[PDB]
Amino acid sequence: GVDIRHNKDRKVRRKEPKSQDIYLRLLVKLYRFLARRTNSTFNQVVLKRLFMSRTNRPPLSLSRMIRKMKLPGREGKTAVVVGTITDDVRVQEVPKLKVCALRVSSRARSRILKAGGKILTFDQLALDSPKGCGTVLLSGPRKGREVYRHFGKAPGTPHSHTKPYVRSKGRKFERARGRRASRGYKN
Amino acid sequence: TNTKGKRRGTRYMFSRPFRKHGVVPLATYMRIYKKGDIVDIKGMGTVQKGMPHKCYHGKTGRVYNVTQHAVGIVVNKQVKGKILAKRINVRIEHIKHSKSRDSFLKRVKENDQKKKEAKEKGTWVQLKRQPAPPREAHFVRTNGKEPELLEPIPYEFMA
Amino acid sequence: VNVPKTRRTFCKKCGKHQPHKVTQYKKGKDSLYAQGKRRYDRKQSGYGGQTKPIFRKKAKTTKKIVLRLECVEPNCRSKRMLAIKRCKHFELGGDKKRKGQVIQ
Amino acid sequence: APSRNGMILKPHFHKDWQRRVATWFNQPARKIRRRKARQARARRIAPRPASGP
Amino acid sequence: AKSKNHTTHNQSRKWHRNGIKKPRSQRYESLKGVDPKFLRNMRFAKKHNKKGLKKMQANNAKAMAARAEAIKALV
RNA sequence: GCGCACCACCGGCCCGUCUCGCCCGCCGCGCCGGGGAGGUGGAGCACGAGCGCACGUGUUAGGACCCGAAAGAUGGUGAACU
RNA sequence: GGUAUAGGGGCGAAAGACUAAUCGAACCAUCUAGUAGCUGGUUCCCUCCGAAGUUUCCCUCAGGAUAGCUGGCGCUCUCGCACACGCAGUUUUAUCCGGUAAAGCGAAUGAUUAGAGGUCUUGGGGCCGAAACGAUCUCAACCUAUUCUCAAACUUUAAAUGGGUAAGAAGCCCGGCUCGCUGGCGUGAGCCGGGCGUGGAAUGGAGUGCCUAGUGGGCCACUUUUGGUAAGCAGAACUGGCG
RNA sequence: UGCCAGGUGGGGAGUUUGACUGGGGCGGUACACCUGUCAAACGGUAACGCAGGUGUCCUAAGGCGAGCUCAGGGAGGACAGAAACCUCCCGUGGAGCAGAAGGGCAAAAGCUCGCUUGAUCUUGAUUUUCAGUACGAAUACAGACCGUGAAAGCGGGGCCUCACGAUCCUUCUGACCUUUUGGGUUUUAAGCAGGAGGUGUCAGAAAAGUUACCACAGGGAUAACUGGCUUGUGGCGGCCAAGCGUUCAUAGCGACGUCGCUUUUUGAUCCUUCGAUGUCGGCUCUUCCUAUCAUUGUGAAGCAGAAUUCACCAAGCGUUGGAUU
RNA sequence: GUCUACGGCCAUACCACCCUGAACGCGCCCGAUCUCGUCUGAUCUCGGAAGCUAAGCAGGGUCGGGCCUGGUUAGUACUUGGAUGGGAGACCGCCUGGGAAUACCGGGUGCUGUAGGCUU
Ligand SMILES: [Zn+2]
């Protein structure tokens, strides 16, 4: 006879990756041991990000990684990205880097190796710095997907700039009553 | 069903009190308001332009915009699912300064004074307010005169 | 309602306040060659009877009178429609009523 | 009935499309037949180019 | 076949099931709803804030030097 | 202290539109073209995240979870009863 | 017995009668698995969470859409890893809001009883009078001090309950810049640099983004209350239950 | 005769014949809006609840600046009287502000004057039903042209709360506006922006009846039976006592008031039943109730006998034959 | 002690009657040429300083009316929450907290800001 609301007693956070691939599970075991032994929170963050789904770890662009490493203070530090590193074609000068990532695109890998940089996997990063010392943790833009453009306040509402679900943009598919001031109203 | 009129049910709210009709006093006109000032809204029947809605009567909000002779104020209104902070434009006569924040500001100044003081002395002074404590047990002196006996009054039909 | 035939008001082309001649607005002919009229005729032609709905549920008994104001100053002559609230009695220059007189 | 921000679409399945559904289970057989016909024509025109004029 | 017209019996319980909250207060609120002349003046001031940056930097350096001298005198 | 991702805000940029205004170019000097500042509208830019396949749920068009009408149309057969 | 009239047709001394046990539109096949907001049914186990009959719109009222109630997927952070920010059907401290209960009508408006002083003022019946405010009362509306009873659409007053706020770092104290706004100097706002931390009680880990089934017939009970004589009647407000 | 055009054309064909509703129909609009109450002192809140109002009107009844105070009452002055005109005083608004009501207003927001059309044009922001979407209405601003006053200032309609309308189509206005398709010119047409023509079932179908010849999918959400709560009404019984009763309230009655009982009448509700509970009477038959017509036993009188009504225990036994319907 | 000009709170300031005002000041008051507007210099405007506290105004008084603030009314009316409390009901009582308003009886009858005067 106790009044406790069991509505949110079960936490929905992930515990193991849903992927059935074996290399990711081996990395999960390694970082589980590292997080439960070492006092560093870097291992815990890396394990949590490894648990995340594909959409929750967007790819990181080479230009974004370059601009994040160019910040003063993180000189000679290894970049740790749980997603994938993708080449950026609109950048010419690429300094040498120390990048740790699950995957790297072929073009980005060629660019980094030609620039004189070094690319490491997560097991190599664990062997080098078990507690993640001298590491810069980076991630891609979470809201970069076009899916989030359709989220938020619904269209046809004042002060809303949400992209509606339209079969094909055009003159006679929208921008009519509800959007034109000359036809009914607008928001 | 009831009508959705703006001034429906405001027979007594938007009405001046007894022996206080006539010309509006000029202190309300000649008192200033700044941004972020806590102000309680009270409608006035004499002035109709810029009159706030009946739902905002008695509600208190902060000032965010000040026009020539009106004030933009954000107030919290609860409508059946949630509380929304919404901004309304209210003329000067329908607005008053709130002393609730002034009472807290005075206590803040007292705390600053009492922290500047008693610091070089080293004696830490109690700054936090405390609820009503026990009544600090004391002695009651019955000097000579004994306590007065109270006999219940017998019933009698008066009316 | 009563309105004067002259009204000094804002002019879009001139940009300043100038006098305007005031007239009441009336509907013109359909000219028989509008796109909607042509579509209506081509749809009504042939068999099938009446295609478009016919409004037979009139309720109100007045129209919003529209004032056409023509700029008096030459070289502009800019017309502009001005709307007024509903009224079932409209006139221009109609007997300004001579406030302070007798009634017989 | 629309439900919480779905795309407005108009499927063109109001006719008797099931009677006029055209399957493609004969695609590999058709490819084999075309290949055989092409080889037969090439063997017919022995010194002439396979592609043609 | 008359039905019930209107009631709000369970509405309070429905509201409080999710725990209705006050609106999210965030610092640096939006400037929507401010008079256009004031907005223009603030925009001009922000645009011209870059003017006289060296004077502000020199004044800050002088203030830092004064504070350093004061703390050296204190110690 | 450098400050990922993300939120709030301030600025900046692109296109449509309004207002005030001053100058630029020429193969054709004109009912030419270009540029500024200040508001506003856009599903926009602001160092990217999409494409293909598979699975799950929800919404529809189709027979459409299964069975159910009173009706309508097309073409044929009945005066062996009446 | 033969023959002629075949289905929106035939035929009918007329009953909507007959037309192969069917006739207010015969029978067979096809469109056709026609449509149904309406009935009925909807197949194994365990575990966890777990509702609504409410908002507004619809020729809407046995139904949908939209919010609400609900589930799932997560994500961003704090930490019993001797070292905590924020949030609340709570209370307390100060500040405002109300016009209901109550009370009043010797105070405004409306109703209303009865006596005293009033040719206040006029008028009707009357009696003493040709009449007379000359004496006598009376009934009519009014007054001067009183008196009896009232008001959901009255109120000078006026609670209990209740509704917004503030109880600090997103705050104070200085120094300097910008302003095409405002001004005599000044404002006011925005920019940068520096100094000061437990800001009433008690309990809670919080915030955020999407996919989203079902529900949109309710009923009962303490208290308040509308119509009705009353109703296991109809219709409302808070809370709690059945559902 | 062949083809167009106009008229006639339930002979024939297709279809429609709103919604709420203490069943439906009839009656009304509670269908779009506004005022006070309902409404329980934030707000919001139902009924075919109560009292009402609206689909107008205004070139002034809008906007300024100035001057006066209104309704009413008293005292006075030739015609002149209760009401014509003039003067003095009192006069918190008891007048007026267009309407229905509420709020509000006194060197006004009222009346009279003088000038005027801020009832003009254009971006946005916000408020009321809100889903926090439109429409309508409204509030602070801003950018131009203005009106008025000496000026501060006020005014982009009416002192505030109501007076109104989506898509499509048509019509008018505006740009030295765009396209009109291979290029060029001109009519025409299609475009952008701002008004109007209207959907009163007022978030907006184009819409007459009957069926007793009827049909189908459903509903006891919804009626006509019974039975359920209540007893207004019907029937029956008490309490007080002004009087009727020749005298005398209570032998028998009983006004003005008031308290109850019954479901053997009609009412109200729709709780059970619309995949069916056979819908009035009469005949036959059994049982039960007393609110007792008569019989048994008694109390009472305006009970001399007879006759008689009033009351008590009391349902054991009886409560008939016919004309009409 | 007090007056004028501009005010703030708007009756403790208002209303009725009586008494007193030394000086400045506020006004009454004298005229219509000029400015100004009316049927009338009545109001307003203008040009003045022969008379006055007569009046306004200021101060005081009324066992004054009213107004403001207290006691009484009264822990009464009412009211949050509670009970397997009473009663046939209408209603009432108790526990737990808050707490009114008339009649009736006391006190008071404007404070104050800026600038400029008089009693030097
Ligand atoms: Zn012009």
The answer, for B84 touching chain E at a CB cutoff of 8 Å, is yes
Nearest residue to A133 via CA among A70, A60, A39, A68: A39
**CB-based contacts of A68: which residues, under 8 Å, 6+ apart?**
A74, A79, A136, A138
In this complex, the answer to whether residue E65 has its CB under 7 A from any atom of chain G, a nucleic strand, is no
List of long-range contacts for B88-93, beta carbons under 8 Å, 24+ apart? B88/B52, B88/B53, B88/B56, B89/B50, B89/B65, B90/B41, B90/B50, B90/B51, B90/B52, B90/B56, B91/B47, B91/B49, B91/B50, B91/B51, B92/B28, B92/B29, B93/B24, B93/B28, B93/B29, B93/B44, B93/B46, B93/B47, B93/B50
Residues A84 and A102 sit within 8 Å (Cβ to Cβ): yes
Provide DSSP, chain A: -----GGG-S----SS-S---HHHHHHHHHHHHHHHHS--HHHHHHHHHHHS-TTTS--EEHHHHHHHHTSTT-TT-EEEEEEEEE--TT-------EEEEEEE-HHHHHHHHHTT-EEE-HHHHHHH-TT-TTEEEE---GGGSGGGGG-SSPSSSTT--PPP--SS-STTTSSSTBT-TTSS-B-
Cβ pair A60, A83 in contact under 8 A = yes
Q: Chain B within 8 Å of E33 (Cβ-Cβ)?
A: yes
What's the full length of chain B, in residues?
Answer: 159
Label the pairing between strands C2-3 and C91-92: parallel
A 155-184 residues with CB below 8 A of D?
A: 165-167
Tokens 């109100």 -> residue: C60
CB A141 within 8 A of CB A148: no
* Token representation of residue A41: 């929170």
CA–CA distance, D30 with D24 (Å, rounded to integer): 10
Cα distances from C20 to residues C1, C69, C81, in angstroms, run 19, 5, 12
At C7, which helix (H) or strand (E)? strand C6-10
- A185 Cβ partners below 8 Å, 6+ apart? A177, A178
SS3 C62: coil
What distance in Å separates the CA atoms of residue B85 and residue B73, rounded to the nearest whole number? 10
Count of residues making up chain E: 75
Query: In DSSP terms, which residues pair with A120 in a beta bridge?
Result: A100
Q: Closest-CA residue in chain A for D4?
A: A154
Instruction: Check D7 against A154: CB less than 8 A apart.
Output: no
Distance from the alpha carbon of residue C23 to the mean position of ligand 1, in angstroms: 16
CA-CA distances (angstroms) from residue B19 to A105, B16, C39? Answer: 84, 8, 72
Q: How far is the CA of C84 from the centre of ligand 1 (A)?
A: 21
| Beta-bridge mates of residue E20 | none
**Cβ-based contacts under 8 A for chains B and E:** 27
Chains with ≥3 CB–CB distances under 8 Å to B: E
CA of C80 to the centre of ligand 1 (A): 10
Q: What CA–CA distance (Å, rounded) separates E59 from E53?
A: 10
Q: What are phi and psi of E71, to 5 degrees?
A: -70, -35
How many helices (H) and strands (E) in chain E? 3, 0
Number of Cβ within a 10 Å radius of residue B21: 11
Which structure tokens are listed for D34?
Answer: 């075309």
For strand G, is any atom closer than 7 Å to the CB of A42?
no
Nearest nucleotide (C1') to the CA of residue D11? F61
**H or E element, residue E41:** helix E36-48
The residue of chain D with its CA nearest to that of A162 is D5
Residue A86 backbone phi and psi in degrees, to 5? -115, 140
E22 contacts on B by Cβ (under 8 Å)? 76, 83
Question: Nearest-CA distance from B103 to chain E in Å?
Answer: 23
Q: Alpha carbon of B156 to those of A182, B151, B153, B159: distances in Å?
A: 84, 15, 9, 9
Are the C-beta atoms of A56 and A142 separated by less than 8 Å? yes
CB A49 within 8 A of CB A139: yes
Q: Sort out which chain A residues have CB atoms less than 8 A from D8's CB and list them.
A: 165-167
How many CB atoms sit inside 10 A of residue C91's CB?
11
| d(C-alpha A118, C-alpha A121), whole Å | 10
CA distance B96 to B24: 14
Which tokens go with E45?
């001031």
CB A65 within 8 A of CB A31: no
Tell me, in angstroms, the distance from the centre of ligand 1 to residue C3's CA. Answer: 20
Strand partners, A98: A118
Please state, in angstroms and rounded to a whole number, the distance separating the CA atoms of residues A176 and A185: 9
Provide the 8-state DSSP code for E66. Answer: H
Interface of E with B in 36-75 (CB under 8 A): none
CA of A45 to the centre of ligand 1 (A): 73
| Cβ contacts of A165 on chain D, cutoff 8 Å | 5-8
Question: Which burial class, exposed, middle or buried, applies to A122 when counting CB atoms under 10 A from its CB (0-12, 13-18, 19+)?
Answer: buried
Question: Do residues A31 and A46 make contact, with C-beta atoms less than 8 angstroms apart?
Answer: yes
Known binding residue C87? Answer is no
| Resolution for this experimental structure (Å) | 3.2
Question: With an 8 Å Cβ cutoff, is D8 touching chain A?
Answer: yes
Identify nearest nucleotide to residue B43 by CA to C1′ distance: G97
CA distance C92 to C22: 9
Closest Cβ–Cβ partner in E15, E20, E35 for B67: E35
Distances D25 to D28, D36, E32 between C-alpha atoms, Å: 8, 19, 63
Nucleotide nearest to A61 (CA to C1'): F48
C1' of G39 to CA of E1 (Å): 20
Q: Which of A102, A83, A139 is nearest to A26 (CA)?
A: A102
Written in H, E and C, the secondary structure of chain B is CCCCCCCCCCCCCCCCCCCCCCCCCCCCCCCCCCCCCEEEECCCCCCCCCCCCHHHCCCEEEEEEECCCEEEEEEEEECCCCEEEEEEEEEHHHEEECHHHHHHHHHHHHHHHHHHCCCCCCCCCCCCCCCCCCCCCCCCCCCCCCCCCCCCCCCCCCC
For the stretch E33-72, what's the b/e string if a residue is b when 16 or more beta carbons lie within 10 angstroms of its beta carbon? ebeeeeeeeeeeeeeeeeeeeeeeeeeeeeeeeeeeeeee
Distance B134 CA to I98 C1' (A): 22
Query: If you ran DSSP here, which 8-state letter would residue C45 be given?
Result: S
First to last CA, chain B: 46
Residues 29-58 on chain E lying near strand G, CB distance under 7 A: 37-38, 40-42, 44-46, 48-49, 51-53, 55-56
Contact predicate A28/A53, CB 8 Å: no
| Secondary structure letter of residue C58 according to DSSP | -
Q: What is the distance, to the nearest Å, from the Cα of residue C25 to the centroid of all Cα atoms in its chain?
A: 3
Write phi, then psi, for B106 (nearest 5 degrees): -60, -40
| Residue A183 alpha carbon to ligand 1 centre in Å | 29
Burial class (CB in 10 A: 0-12, 13-18, 19+), C57: exposed
Q: Give the nucleotide at minimum CA-to-C1' distance from E33.
A: H125
Q: Do D6 and A154 touch (CB under 8 A)?
A: no
Consecutive H or E run containing D30: helix D27-44
Place of tokens 């007798």: C102
